[model samples]
Target: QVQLVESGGNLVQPGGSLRLSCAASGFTFGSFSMSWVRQAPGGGLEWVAGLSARSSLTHYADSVKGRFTISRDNAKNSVYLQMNSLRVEDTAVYYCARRSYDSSGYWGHFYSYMDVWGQGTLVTVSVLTQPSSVSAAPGQKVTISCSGSTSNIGNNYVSWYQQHPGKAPKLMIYDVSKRPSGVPDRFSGSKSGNSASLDISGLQSEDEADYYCAAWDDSLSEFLFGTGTKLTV
Candidate 1:
């Protein structure tokens, strides 16, 4: 069975940082670049970014910059997503997926979206845990990853999101965090090496909620959802 495996578990704190992983199997590693998505409790989907194992390219959504990084090891065939500068609002369930890239000459016009998605890993930022200071560190790289549970969905695309308390969710990550215009520089996103990530600095209460990652399925051509994340006090 094709699967995207993530490491780490739930954290409970007011200001803390957490790390996770996404591994792949059941397919050729060189054939697909993994993508990462975030899902908050009771929230919608968002696009963060993607990684190309063949090209080693990363694309982040518009809203995330200077907050995360994506990387991979061709020898190990594993993708790493590291996020730092944790805060209570940063809690969420991050997922990995494998997107399909269509090179069928005449059918090369396939739309970009996530196809196969992972089950998702949970990370909660809070004061009661590590990285309580809530800020980014110099030379520290954060990432979000996307791998699939199946082999045939490599052509699909991946995405990320952001949600606040008692309000409609906002699109933080999309099409590889391109800064979507009108967004602040404090929020940056990117993909490289074989993963995606979203970074938000100067944390605030409004940022509290569950975030999500998404992608379009090529075979089913339907949208896939990552597991939800629950933010705590």
Candidate 2:
């Protein structure tokens, strides 16, 4: 069992600094690496920074590099995000997620997959957008793209999330295309040279919501998320 509870509301002035926190329980905080992800009020999701398991390494996205920092407190079983040089575009709901890694012995391969999440905390300085959408009939198939550059999408891994209204996003796909346990086969993920994609088939009414793509950007050395697409049934 695992749970993450992010501390609530914070409003910071432009050029000011803010530190947000997320507490972890039900699991050893040192066993799994943690990531800080953000979603603007009405804009797409974006990756911020990550603290490797055991605090051995840390990565920051080019977008937020120089302005953000991540660290953890094993004693407190929590993670923190320090944001500086803030601007209006920085306002968002910041989530703290646990990254999972799997190894299959020899000839094995693995990738980071987020399995648990914190509801998210906020930092002030905001502006937003992301109303793009797709409409399809039931049973029809649709694809949502997460376009990027060689620096971010060419060789980096990707993940996807599904968010219904008034709900925290759910991990639907990870390591590009692998579905997590309990995720319907109707949803699939894939990656090409500079872009990754999500396909949902046999679509149903419940599928009509928002889908977001996430990946680690090579240049920024941090995580990144797509603008997100809304599906209409």
Candidate 3:
């Protein structure tokens, strides 16, 4: 029953600062980690930062390391992101997601996937690429790669999501290969050398959608998503 809600100003002038908030309910707020993700207008998703309430730890993406700050208020069950010195390029919708922990391992010692997500907050700095679309014949195999940050892709589990126009993103593959219920067998996943890929066999028209790859990096305790790839058949 975990739920998250994000709120912030929708517009900010260049060089101005923006602060976003995410409030959590239905769970112990101070027990797990929360992450911030962004999506530019008509563009792909990006991992901005992660904050752990228990340890008061923060991890920032290389692109936003110096300017974006992640923090939390455990007493209020809330997380915050403050972006300073914003430019027009910084305009985008931001989302906050919570990581589900593997509680069986020594007092929730291990973290897993992002199971809960907030309704994204659209941020505009007063301003934003498409992945190469790949096509293949039926029964042919095609692999779509996801480039990840060096610190975010070392022997970690990768996940894939599918998004069609006017539809919410669906989780198709997780833990690098495990398919969620109802996903077809044609989809598979693999990872190598700082990148993860999704393989589709027997490509079909229904598979045509924006495909995105994500991974949970242990070192940073953050989840990173790649620029999505559009699939065609």
Candidate 4:
């Protein structure tokens, strides 16, 4: 029973700074890792940074490597994100999430996912951008691209997810090109340079939803997501 709550001001000026906080409870705060995620209005999610609960070590996205700082106060069971030299593009809703891990893999390899999340705190930075909406005819092949920082997009661990409004997101692909059990074969994933693409062949009306591409960034040792693209059939 883990829970998280985020707190911060809703407004910031360009070239300024803002600090947000996430309070975690219902579990040993130092037992599991935590991460910060962001989302623009009507957009997808993005992983900004992660913090090791035990070691307090941090990893940041290349786009934010020097612009953002993540720290934790184990004694208070809270994590903090400090963003500096903000731009209008930095305006978005921020959330804190717990990283789910399975250490039962062969040779003790660790597999990870995000299982718990905070109600996001909105941060306005004067202006923002909207995710591009795409449409295709049924049965047609379509490809949606995700733009991200170079360090986070070059990995083969890219994944794809689908979400309908007011519904939870579903994992459609993982490990760059592998579909999870029960996912239709029509969906596939691929990456090139600082971007990734999700290809859907033989699309159906039911396939219409918001599509997001995620990848395990080797540089950050964390999972990052695209701003999302809307699909209409």
**Which structure among the candidates has the greatest lDDT?**
2
- Quote the positional error of residue 173 for candidate 1 in Å: 22
Stretches > 4 Å off in candidate 2? 13-17, 62-68, 84-86, 103-110, 125-131, 149-151, 192-195
Per-residue alpha-carbon lDDT of model 1 for 1-233, expressed as tens digits? 76666787667565444556677777665577557766556544545656764777776654444556777766666677766565555566777766554421233222344444566777776500111113334434333344443311244334555445433344455565555445566566654433434565654444445554444545543355444343322
- Could you tell me which 10 consecutive residues in candidate 2 have the lowest summed lDDT? 101-110
TM-score of each: 0.49, 0.80, 0.73, 0.63
Clashing pairs in 4: none
Give the C-alpha lDDT of model 4.
0.71
Candidates by lDDT, descending order:
2, 3, 4, 1
lDDT of 3 by residue, 8-82 (tens): 856888888988999999987668776787777787777788866468888898878899988888788888898
In Å, residue 129's CA in model 4 sits off its true spot by 20
**Winner by TM-score between candidate 4 and candidate 1:** 4
Candidate 1: regions farther than 4 A off: 12-16, 103-110, 127-233
Candidates sorted on TM-score, descending: 2, 3, 4, 1
Kindly indicate the candidate among 2 and 3 with the higher TM-score.
2
| Comparing 1 and 3 on lDDT, the stronger one | 3
222 in model 4: Cα distance from truth in Å? 5.2
- Whole-model Cα lDDT of every candidate shown, in order: 0.53, 0.76, 0.73, 0.71
